[PDB]
Amino acid sequence: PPTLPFHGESAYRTDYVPKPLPEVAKPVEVKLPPTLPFNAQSCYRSEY
Amino acid sequence: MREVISIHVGQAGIQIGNACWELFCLEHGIQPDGQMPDAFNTFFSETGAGKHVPRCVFLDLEPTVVDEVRTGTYRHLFHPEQLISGKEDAANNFARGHYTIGKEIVDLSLDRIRKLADNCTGLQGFLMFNAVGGGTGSGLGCLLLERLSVDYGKKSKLNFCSWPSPQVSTAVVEPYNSVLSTHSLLEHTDVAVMLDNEAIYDICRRNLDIERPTYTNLNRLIAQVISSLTASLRFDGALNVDVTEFQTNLVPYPRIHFMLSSYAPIISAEKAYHEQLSVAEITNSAFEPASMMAKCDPRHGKYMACCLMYRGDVVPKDVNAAVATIKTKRTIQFVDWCPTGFKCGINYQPPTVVPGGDLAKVMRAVCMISNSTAIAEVFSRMDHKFDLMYAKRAFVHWYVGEGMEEGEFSEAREDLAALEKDYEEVGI
Ligand SMILES: Nc1nc2c(ncn2[C@@H]2O[C@H](COP(=O)(O)OP(=O)(O)OP(=O)(O)O)[C@@H](O)[C@H]2O)c(=O)[nH]1
Ligand SMILES: [Mg+2]
C-alpha cells in the first residue's frame, strides 16, 4: 500500500504570518510667522 | 506611566488576543521577536536591549490552543510563561472551571499578574477577554474576576464578552454557562462590553462582502475596536478619553454598566474608494441598527449614554456637527434624564491596516460604545433559553457532580431577573 503526503496548515500559521511593518517617518514641520515690527508710540512722546 | 494589563482567558480569549497583539505590534513597530528598528508603555515594557514584551497573561485549561501560540511566529515575542496552560479542559462546564480543576491554574496566573503589575508605575485598567457561554472563559473567568477585585481594590477591570448569539450558539449548555456568568460580569466587572458573534458575522457579510468569514476575520474587527479604545492612551489627541473618563460618562448606575460597540469605517478595499468616508458619513453608519456588534436593535430601546471615539484626521467641528445631526434624528431616542449623551474623543493617529487583512486603509474612524435600555432583550432572550432547559433539570447532574450546589442555578436566574427589572425602570 502507498502512503499519501500530508498537506496540513493550522489556521494560526496560515493567517498569522509575520507581516511587513508599516513605513512611518513623517514629521509635521511647522513654520513660525515672523514677529511684526512694533509700530506703537506714547502720546506724551507723540505731541510733547 | 499609563498602562493596561490584558488578560485573555479561554479559547476565544486567546484567539482574539492573537489578533490584538498582532495589530498592536504592527502599529507601534515591534517586530515578532520584540525588537523595533515612549508611546508603547500602555501595552509593552522594555527589557533594555531594545526588547519589548507584550503585557498579556494568556489563560486556558486545554494546552491545544496555547501551544499553538508558543510554536507559531509569535513565540519569542511573549515571555515564555505568560502563556499559562493547564492539562485538561473544563469541557464547557461552568462548575468545572470554578469549583474544580481550574483552581490550580489560578494561583499561577495571579502570580504573574502581580509580576506584570508591580513593574508598572500606575495601572489604569485590567483589560479582560472571555468567552461567556463556555467552560474556561466562564468558570475560570468568574473566579478570576472575583479574585482580582479582592486583591486589587478599585482598579477598573474592563471586559470584552463573547456572549452567545441569540439564535445560534454551537452548544446546548451555553444557556447554562452564560446565566451562571452573570454572577461575575455584573458585580465584579465595570466595563462589561457585550459582543455577539452573529452580529459581527452580519457586519462581515453586509460591509466587507465576505459571505464565509472564519473566526480570525471576526477577531480582526474586534482588535481594531480595542486599539481605537486605547488610542488616546498611547497616542496624542485633541480630546483624550482614558479609562477613568470612561466610567463617568457612560455608566449612570453601578449595576447598569453593559455596553454595545460599533466601529464603522468597516469598508472593503473595493468599496472604500467610491465614497468619501467623511466624519458625518462614518457616524451615520455607526448609529445604524445593523452595524451594532451585539444582536440588539437600539430602536426598540432608549440610549442613556454614548461614548464616540473619532480617530484620524477628524476636525472637532465635524465631530460637533455630526453629533448635532444624530441628535436631530428621530430614529434614536435618548432618555429624558440625559440632555447631553455624547461624550466624544479625538485621536490624531489614523487606524492602521494589517497587510493581508480584510480591511482597507481609511483616514477616519468612529468607535461608538453606548449604554441603552435595549440590551434587556439580550439577557431576556437567554432567559427563555435557561427556563426551557432547567424546567426538568437538564445537564444539572453533571454540574452538581463536581461540587456545584443544587440551587446555584436559581439565584443566577434571579440575578438575571434583577437586571431585567433594572433596565425597564431606567427607561420610564
Ligand atoms: N470572538 C470569537 N469567538 C469565538 C472564537 N472561537 C470560538 N468562539 C466562541 O466561543 C464560544 C464557546 O467558547 P469556546 O470557544 O469553547 O471557549 P471557552 O468559552 O473558553 O470554552 P473552552 O472550550 O473551555 O475554552 C462559541 O459559541 C463560539 O462562538 C473566536 O475565535 N473568536
Ligand atoms: Mg476549551
UniProtKB/TrEMBL annotation, chain A:
<comment type="similarity">
    <text>Belongs to the FAM154 family.</text>
</comment>
<protein>
    <submittedName>
        <fullName>Microtubule associated protein SPM1</fullName>
    </submittedName>
</protein>
